[PDB]
Amino acid sequence: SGFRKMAFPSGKVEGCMVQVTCGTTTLNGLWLDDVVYCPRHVICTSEDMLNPNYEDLLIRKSNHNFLVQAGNVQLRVIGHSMQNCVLKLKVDTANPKTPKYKFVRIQPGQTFSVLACYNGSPSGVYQCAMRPNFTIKGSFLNGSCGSVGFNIDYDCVSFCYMHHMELPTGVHAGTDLEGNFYGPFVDRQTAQAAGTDTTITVNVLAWLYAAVINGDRWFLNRFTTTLNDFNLVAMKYNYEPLTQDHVDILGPLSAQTGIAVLDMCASLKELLQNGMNGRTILGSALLEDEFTPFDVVRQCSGVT
Amino acid sequence: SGFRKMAFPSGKVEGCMVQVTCGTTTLNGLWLDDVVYCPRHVICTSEDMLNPNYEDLLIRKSNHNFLVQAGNVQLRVIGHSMQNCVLKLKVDTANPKTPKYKFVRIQPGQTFSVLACYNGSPSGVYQCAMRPNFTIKGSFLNGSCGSVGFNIDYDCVSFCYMHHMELPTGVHAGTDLEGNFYGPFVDRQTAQAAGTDTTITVNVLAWLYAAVINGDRWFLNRFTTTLNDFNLVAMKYNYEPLTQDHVDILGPLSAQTGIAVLDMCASLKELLQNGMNGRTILGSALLEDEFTPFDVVRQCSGVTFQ
Ligand SMILES: *C(=N)c1ncn(-c2ncnc3nc(SC)sc23)n1
Ligand SMILES: *C(=N)c1ncn(-c2ncnc3nc(SC)sc23)n1
Ligand code: NA
């Protein structure tokens, strides 16, 4: 029993984290085979960052300007290039600890594990979701840039996030490993903000199913609803629309508990309209939307 | 900025997890140098569990009755002994991935990382606290016994918890790595139940300090309190007493934020009296008691967002 926000075991990723220094900036890089990936903003000073011409800044640097440290050992950079907003530093040594991996771009609503690192050294691991507004609610201090997010899908690590910056509201923005930002953000000092966010409906439903599986049932009721009427309510409470795809994706959880999706939707309607009346669900007083259906299934089955 | 329940990186522990089988029972073990530690109940049948005589069950086993699998490789058991409620299986091979480590027995209120494992293979990692009633609020299915809890301060792993069982309320009980149970629990199917739990006051305070460090002051007030009046009130909400040790331990968080401990105590009093009135603190609508002072200092900036 029990239900906890749970990260993937981080060991396969820990063996890929390195320190990258350029001038007076130190941040983290990801060392896979003979390439180290890191945010291209590592080459910028404060002044550069106001209006950077990355092409022009990079051509002025030599290989030997990039100091890359894997634990105690220096790696030698033998090439550098840019792909979108990430820098690729070719090094002389292949990482002997490179796991089987892929670069994937995730969708809003999907969760992943973050390995927070400072000076190329892993510090902590937690679970995040890509918010509808394409930010993440992370925990990152200065020096954390280049930390990555990942899922593990067999023995294969799927890297999906590299950290680039913090927005004024204290939430976080970054790229996929091909260097494309999640969201309408840029790696320069200009005014940028998180857009208004919404709640990830399908995930709240998943969590309601988790709660039932774990014996927390007080919010169930005799009523059912339709997709259209439910989505009228969702819109009103700043919830993402529920689609037929979401209903399909919730099928396994529905079958296991005997609660049809639209039956659970009637519970959620009531919670949104009436609140919780001083009660909690899985120890929370708010509705939790950072567990996916697959997250719930994985934790309430035991896959390893 | 931000604030999250954050576990230690699990890789140093992942390289120590193995599968142990005895008869039809499979669970997890912890492979350090040439010893595999696991719960002694691996030798029991379900019938045995009502009144097991572990000494008598164990004397009937040979080395070769214990099957230990490290990933793909079988290890050879060459010795066994029981210490308290753990079995130590001596094996032929030293773990080449053994980290620097020690065993520590923790106190109620201390937090640690759990690596939940099934069939000797890691499944996930999360943060837990030793509750005042000596249970943990974990996430564990059948097959999870032998999963361990740890901290990693510097490069040294401190093992503090091995999982043994689930209590009827759905909370979890286990031992230190010397095989002593936390709490009055036994590895026996009896009527045993977790005592009524309380909130870990010092940790709630720590978290209030975290919220200040991160730029939130709405819950502060102009009042102060004596330690004794605070404790008189707190006990009426099922909060653990705050001791002078706890006040000492909160000193650095007090210095960084400019808010005296007993002034933060007054804020908590008011929060308990009033609740939150639709507001959140660090994204929670409840008061959070699973972050220690040390946890807050580790995660938060040393510069308060004033
Ligand atoms: C990542 N290691 C990092 N530390 C500090 N910063 C940072 N500080 C100030 N401005 C700023 N702008 C960025 S992109 C628009 S990243 C950054 N990053
Ligand atoms: C740990 N690997 C595990 N799986 C299943 N059980 C278990 N099941 C039923 N009863 C029971 N009692 C125990 S100690 C009193 S452990 C256990 N454990
Ligand atoms: Na219903």
Swiss-Prot record, chain A:
Impact noted for substituting residue 205 to V: In strain: Zeta/P.2
Domain Peptidase C30: 1-304
Phenotypic consequence of residue 145 to A: Complete loss of 3C-like proteinase nsp5 cleavage
Residue spans, topological domain Cytoplasmic: 1-304
Subcellular location: Host cytoplasm; Host Golgi apparatus; Host nucleus
Catalytic activity: TSAVLQ-|-SGFRK-NH2 and SGVTFQ-|-GKFKK the two peptides corresponding to the two self-cleavage sites of the SARS 3C-like proteinase are the two most reactive peptide substrates. The enzyme exhibits a strong preference for substrates containing Gln at P1 position and Leu at P2 position
Activity regulation: Inhibited by pyridone-containing alpha-ketoamides compounds 13a and 13b. In turn, alpha-ketoamide 13b (tert-butyl (1-((S)-1-(((S)-4-(benzylamino)-3,4-dioxo-1-((S)-2-oxopyrrolidin-3-yl)butan-2-yl)amino)-3-cyclopropyl-1-oxopropan-2-yl)-2-oxo-1,2-dihydropyridin-3-yl)carbamate) inhibits SARS-CoV-2 replication in human lung cells. Inhibited ex vivo by michael acceptor inhibitor N3. Inhibited ex vivo by compound 11a and 11b.
Cross-link Glycyl lysine isopeptide (Lys-Gly) (interchain with G-Cter in ubiquitin): where in chain: 5, 90
Active site: 41, 145
Function per UniProt: Cleaves the C-terminus of replicase polyprotein at 11 sites. Recognizes substrates containing the core sequence [ILMVF]-Q-|-[SGACN]. Cleaves and inactivates human TRMT1, preventing tRNA guanine(26)-dimethylation of tRNAs. May cleave human NLRP1 in lung epithelial cells, thereby activating the NLRP1 inflammasome pathway. May cleave human GSDMD, triggering alternative GSDME-mediated epithelial cell death upon activation of the NLRP1 inflammasome, which may enhance the release interleukins 1B, 6, 16 and 18. Also able to bind an ADP-ribose-1''-phosphate (ADRP).
Subunit composition and interactions: 3CL-PRO exists as monomer and homodimer. Only the homodimer shows catalytic activity. Interacts with host FBXO22; this interaction promotes the proteasomal degradation of nsp5.
UniProt name for this protein: 3C-like proteinase nsp5
Organism encoding this protein: Severe acute respiratory syndrome coronavirus 2 (2019-nCoV)
Full-length numbering of the shown residues: 3264 to 3567 of 4405
